[PDB]
Symmetry: C3
Subunit: 306 residues, 3 copies
């Protein structure tokens, strides 16, 4: 027996997001559907396993869950559970819209209840500290709302989706200023640096969700978001040797969700005949990086360190 | 004799905003006009009284006014005076556009002069402290600009209104990051917690002003603003027992202005056939809460504690 | 021999921006073209000189360049070099599009490489301090991106321009919150106060770049930006006696770039028949202020203090 570290949900999250990116190429490149289906089935399978393992954690290691929940830093990773649940729902929609819709509502109600209970509680003061100002806060505050937005749009609830989209977008712009100031002043310790990948998530998950809700119209907002997204990509690329100062490790899966979301947005830019060359590069880049994550991960489930 | 506490202007402010919300239902529900007129007359009457009392304060308790003005925290409540003056102008416009226009210009010039003199002065440093980072700052910095925007639009000056709208919207997004970080780190003392209601003001006053300037077109921006607004509403609802830890008190009128503004925006969403169910719920919720404020207040003007 | 202080590039920057503002009036007021050409030639000439002087600095005072580069505050002024280079390119486009395009690409690649190397490096922590939070950070982070956006648009690359525009706009909104909080708490020392002029740059350079990329369409975003821009103008006007507490000095050229950008945006508002009266006032105001800078500067190159 062992208690599953909640951050592991980042793995099926990244693979699910990548399935959806490929799904959106099927009409341009039919073989894309098989690639999407394979990734989607693997993501769903891993999600099922991790859900069962987390159920075990709740039953037999509840005090560990309680402690992560009340931590002003570690609580954020719990949002990965409803986020991944929604993305699995989006995947499954291609086969069974009824089950997909159940998962989407469970994830949406769950994430909203989670943030209403815990994110607001921080405003009581005295628990969260300056050192609690971590990229992971984006998970409950931003990513979860964007995921609800795009999943609700998939179900045909575009205007409700806009509400969640707005919550996520404004929450992002309201937190990032203090996060980047904190990173400038305080050197984030090596053990947390892989979570710098989450800094890439807001702009690309934002544009991906936006394009899902607005019928794929590549407009001025979408281009603005891509621009800041690439800026952050370049910054993180420059920072990569510092990020992995103490070695390559499994936390690097933090980059899969934002990169897959970048790839997803690239399919819409391509369909809209906007920056097609950039779109191709972005889509290929994301896939290569996530492929490397998969390979490094196999070259290790092997050694039994996963 | 006594010096009127400047925050009391929040009362006619909330009632005035609520009059305007009902005014905007008259063509859907004719009886709404009588409700609007009654609220508008009560708001105007209370405003007249409070203005006369504040004139008395300026003449006979000037050092108290001077001290509040120079305080890096308490100065903000003075903005309630021109804000309420503008809203009374919007109300009176239905009966006498000439007087309404005088009040709107007096409030607009007044708030702009006030913020130009005092908000900028803070940037000289050394007076404002980290502990000065309070929700009340939204009054001169954000709410006053949105109110000018919507009042100018009422008078037919839409493009000038957009200038004030932009000032308020960007000022909001520029202050909120540091406010929420401060609330996370430092527990706001009980005596100030009722002013957490002002945190609800920016998104709903923003969307209300926006819809006033853009002819009621419920577009993507409006939906985005509503979404963040509801997020903040849910957060504040969860936080309510903490907000009133030391008891229910008259400061809770801080919630009336934002809730009335939410109600106003809901009339436009309803007219635009966007999220009609949400609109109805929001409009009813605001009215019930403000009704409770009125009742608690009567159950007390009685006991002589007002 | 002497090492040129990098901030001096603000002079040709301001004059170049002003040339472009006048250029945009030529079809309304033909004599505007001669005024534009004169300013453009002077700006270009000064830029050539300063470039040659900075080449000398790199060859013979390299350790001074190294120290400014690694400083978490002084590095920002180096961005003036590619920024001015792009604006000279925009000027020269009227005479030789081939040379103009070379300068625009050199400035764009240069600024992007500069920010990718240095702005991201700050996120490693421990070098940048709270006291490093200065208006000058806007140069590499915001102004350089907007300048690329507008210069790329000039060359016909509107969608690539939108990427740079988005990078600059979001970078602005993400830094300003912490800058204004820092100015409120810590009094900026007199020797740095002239750089308060850079606080005026983001909103006006943003709207100028925006109108360059969107074919001059004066829309809701443009009006919103102008509104916040004027708010900041009024604030800085009120603050001016404090800014020059220790005397008038050459650092006041920090105001030329934002004021010239305001003037440029005013030509587009005027062409669009939006707020024509405001546009005229803004254009005249900027020119008078920059004229005063020129006069104060002559009344001094004289005394040999430049
Ligand atoms: C993902 C789920 C983790 C949920 C753990 C939540 C713990 C809820 O919080 C619990 O609330 C109680 C008040 O009812 C207290 O008595 C407990 O001390 C407290 O830990
Ligand atoms: C993603 C799924 C969300 C699960 C969140 C469960 C949060 C439990 O929340 C708790 O519940 C108590 C009531 O017992 C609260 O009053 C406390 O604030 C809290 O500790
Ligand atoms: C913090 C991020 C800033 C968001 C910038 C929003 C820019 C919205 O841009 C708008 O988009 C429309 C669609 O192409 C345009 O037609 C409008 O002309 C323009 O005002
Ligand atoms: C992120 C979006 C990725 C889209 C992948 C498209 C790859 C196809 O690539 C392209 O195909 C075109 C016609 O199909 C060709 O004419 C182009 O030359 C070629 O670049
Ligand atoms: C801060 C935002 C930076 C975004 C930079 C995008 C870089 C350009 O991207 C590239 O652009 C070329 C245009 O010169 C294309 O020909 C290529 O096909 C494309 O790969
Ligand atoms: C709502 C109105 C309150 C206005 C009080 C403003 C006080 C103005 O400030 C006053 O300015 C003077 C400089 O002229 C000083 O001599 C006084 O010390 C100072 O208090
Ligand atoms: C809402 C109405 C606005 C009233 C604001 C009055 C502000 C008075 O402002 C004062 O005036 C002095 C001149 O005597 C200033 O120079 C000072 O900065 C200030 O203390
Ligand atoms: C900080 C808040 C962010 C503001 C987000 C602005 C989104 C503007 O959104 C825009 O709105 C228009 C009207 O429906 C659209 O048609 C455009 O297609 C889109 O770019
Ligand atoms: C905030 C906006 C509040 C608007 C209140 C509308 C209340 C009317 O309620 C409605 O009236 C319709 C026709 O009038 C009915 O057909 C609907 O069933 C009913 O829900
Ligand atoms: C973070 C933003 C959260 C906004 C959540 C809005 C909740 C839904 O709002 C409700 O939506 C239902 C749709 O299922 C409707 O049928 C109801 O009529 C409406 O009351
Ligand atoms: C505008 C140009 C200024 C460039 C100065 C950049 C200095 C680059 O940084 C240098 O990098 C080296 C690592 O290669 C180190 O050995 C030096 O110590 C370091 O100063
Ligand atoms: C505007 C023109 C940009 C010039 C920026 C040059 C930055 C040099 O950058 C340096 O280069 C090293 C490699 O030697 C880096 O690895 C270091 O991070 C850095 O010190
Ligand atoms: C941080 C700055 C906030 C940006 C606000 C963006 C407002 C975009 O505003 C939009 O602009 C379009 C063009 O006029 C409109 O038609 C749309 O109706 C509206 O949603
Ligand atoms: C920033 C934009 C400045 C534009 C300068 C325009 C100055 C012209 O000024 C104007 O010219 C019009 C016709 O040309 C006249 O009819 C107007 O009365 C007059 O105000
Ligand atoms: C916070 C944003 C403040 C912007 C205020 C702009 C002030 C008005 O600007 C002026 O507006 C008049 C309208 O009364 C015009 O008649 C004038 O021609 C114009 O100069």
């Amino acid at each position: 027996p062992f208690p599953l570290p909640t951050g592991y949900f980042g793995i099926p999250l990244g693979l699910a997001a990548l399935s959806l990116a490929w799904f959106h190429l099927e009409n341009l490149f039919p073989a894309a559907r098989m690639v999407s289906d394979v990734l989607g089935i693997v993501a769903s399978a891993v999600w099922i396993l991790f859900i069962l393992m987390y159920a075990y954690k709740l039953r037999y290691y509840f005090e560990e869950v309680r402690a992560e929940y009340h931590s002003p830093v570690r609580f954020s990773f719990i949002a990965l559970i409803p986020i991944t649940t929604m993305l699995v729902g989006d995947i499954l929609y291609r086969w069974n819209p009824l089950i997909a819709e159940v998962l989407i509502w469970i994830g949406t109600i769950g994430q909203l209840l989670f943030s209403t209970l815990r994110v607001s509680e921080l405003w009581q003061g005295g628990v969260f500290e300056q050192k609690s100002t971590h990229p992971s806060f984006y998970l409950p505050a931003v990513a979860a709302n964007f995921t609800s937005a795009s999943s609700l749009a998939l179900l045909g609830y575009h205007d409700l989706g806009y509400l969640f989209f707005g919550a996520g977008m404004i929450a992002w712009i309201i937190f990032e200023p203090v996060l980047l100031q904190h990173l400038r002043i305080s050197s984030l310790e090596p053990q947390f640096r892989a979570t710098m990948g989450i800094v890439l998530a807001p702009p690309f998950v934002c544009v991906s969700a936006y394009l899902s809700i607005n019928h794929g119209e590549v407009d001025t907002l979408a281009k603005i978001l891509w621009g800041y997204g690439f800026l952050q990509l370049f910054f993180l690329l420059r920072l990569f040797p510092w990020i992995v100062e103490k070695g390559l490790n499994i936390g690097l899966w933090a980059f899969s969700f934002p990169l897959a979301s970048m790839a997803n947005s690239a399919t819409a830019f391509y369909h809209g005949n906007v920056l097609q060359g950039v779109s191709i590069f972005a889509f290929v880049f994301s896939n290569v990086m996530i492929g490397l994550l998969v390979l490094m991960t196999i070259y290790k489930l092997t050694k039994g360190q996963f």
